[PDB]
Amino acid sequence: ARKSAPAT
Amino acid sequence: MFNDRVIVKKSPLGGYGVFARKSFEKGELVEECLCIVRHNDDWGTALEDYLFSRKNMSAMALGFGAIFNHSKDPNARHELTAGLKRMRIFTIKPIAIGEEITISYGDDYWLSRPRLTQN
Numbered sequence: 001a002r003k004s005a006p007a008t
Numbered sequence: 009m010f011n012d013r014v015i016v017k018k019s020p021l022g023g024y025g026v027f028a029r030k031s032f033e034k035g036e037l038v039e040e041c042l043c044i045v046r047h048n049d050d051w052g053t054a055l056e057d058y059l060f061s062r063k064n065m066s067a068m069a070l071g072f073g074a075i076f077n078h079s080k081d082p083n084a085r086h087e088l089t090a091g092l093k094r095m096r097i098f099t100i101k102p103i104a105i106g107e108e109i110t111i112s113y114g115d116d117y118w119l120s121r122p123r124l125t126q127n
């Protein structure tokens with residue numbers, strides 16, 4: 001799995 | 009590789025890491041970088057450990073974005089805009105000069121890599 005990408 | 013705020017150098021966590029060149033206040037912006045975005049399946053295997061992903065899209069952060077190491081006890085956080093076009097790294101607490109700046113990759117990144125040891 002790749003890194004998470006939290007939303008602004 | 010450096011700027012007025014940070015420097016890249018050997019990290020005790022592994023390989024290279026991003027370190028503070030100056031002190032940072034809580035909530036201060038550490039880095040803002042552009043990202044190249046494409047569907048998850050178009051990236052080959054080269055950047056599997058570097059990419060950020062949301063749904064069916066993955067993004068490769070330019071600038072210092074892809075160099076920040078991970079920590080279970082991070083002093084910074086990251087966020088990506090709609091479309092994953094830009095990424096911002098903000099501190100979540102004060103950071104002193106010489107301290108490594110870390111973010112959280114998310115649990116799955118590590119759970120999916122049992123052979124890799126987390127520092």
Ligand SMILES: Nc1ncnc2c1ncn2[C@@H]1O[C@H](CSCC[C@H](N)C(=O)O)[C@@H](O)[C@H]1O
Binds near residue numbers: 022076125126127
């Ligand atoms: N807390 C941590 N413990 C061990 N390795 C880590 C880590 N955080 C990051 N890494 C390493 O960094 C990789 C992602 S890329 C981050 C930059 C990397 N250190 C480099 O020199 O290029 C991970 O897959 C892992 O190998």
